[PDB]
Ligand SMILES: Nc1nc2c(ncn2[C@@H]2O[C@H](COP(=O)(O)OP(=O)(O)O)[C@@H](O)[C@H]2O)c(=O)[nH]1
């Protein structure tokens with residue numbers, strides 16, 4: 133409840149974004165003791181913030197996940213990024229104003245979007261122009277971690293090849309994703325960040341039910357077998373989960389404050 137971290141999920145509707153939010157919170161909020169299914173989630177039509185307290189080791193922190201409406205459902209989707217871009221810049225503006233005030237708060241509320249999870253449809257080809265355009269715009273103002281939505285849609289071979297095509301599109305379009313190579317501070321950071329970089333975009337699966345096996349809580353998605361979403365042999369959600377821990381959260385925030393928010397300040401100076 134001290135250290136704050138804000139994640140936004142972004143992507144077209146029907147990619148399992150709202151589902152993965154619930155999966156992520158459950159993956160970091162321990163629960164001992166029954167076989168239960170999840171309720172159906174309505175289509176997300178408004179930007180909404182979901183905040184829960186989570187504990188790592190024994191230290192508490194406030195995790196906020198921002199759910200967003202879909203884009204790309206229309207014939208013409210020009211400027212469909214504006215509501216999300218507006219939200220992001222609004223948080224920067226709030227923080228800036230709190231910071232510049234003469235009688236500022238002793239503890240400034242940080243509602244800045246520290247990272248965006250960008251959901252890519254599991255098409256099997258390459259990145260769509262819309263998603264390229266949206267991620268490009270986002271990457272200029274916020275940390276981006278792309279993910280393959282509903283990765284259970286892909287065989288392993290399809291997944292490997294799809295990742296190569298997506299990475300090629302990101303790189304050829306100059307879309308920097310977290311962790312950016314230029315921000316590696318030392319050799320240990322490099323070795324850790326290389327593994328993340330090689331795995332991005334993460335093949336994730338969202339859970340629709342939980343149970344317990346041999347004392348261990350399993351977050352799972354049903355199929356005509358059960359996908360254990362935290363099993364690294366089933367999908368890569370666990371790697372995403374592990375990226376979103378105390379130490380890397382801090383590095384993500386550090387880039388948000390020192391790179392993106394600082395860039396925003398410069399923008400506000402070049403305007404007035
Ligand atoms: N196959 C598959 N379906 C999923 C996954 N995650 C969610 N779903 C289903 O996809 C549908 C849309 O989920 P939702 O979270 O509302 O997607 P959103 O519109 O992006 O927020 C729901 O019926 C979910 O049960 C997944 O990882 N794989």
Ligand SMILES: [Mg+2]
Nearest residue numbers: 149150175176
């Ligand atoms: Mg949704």
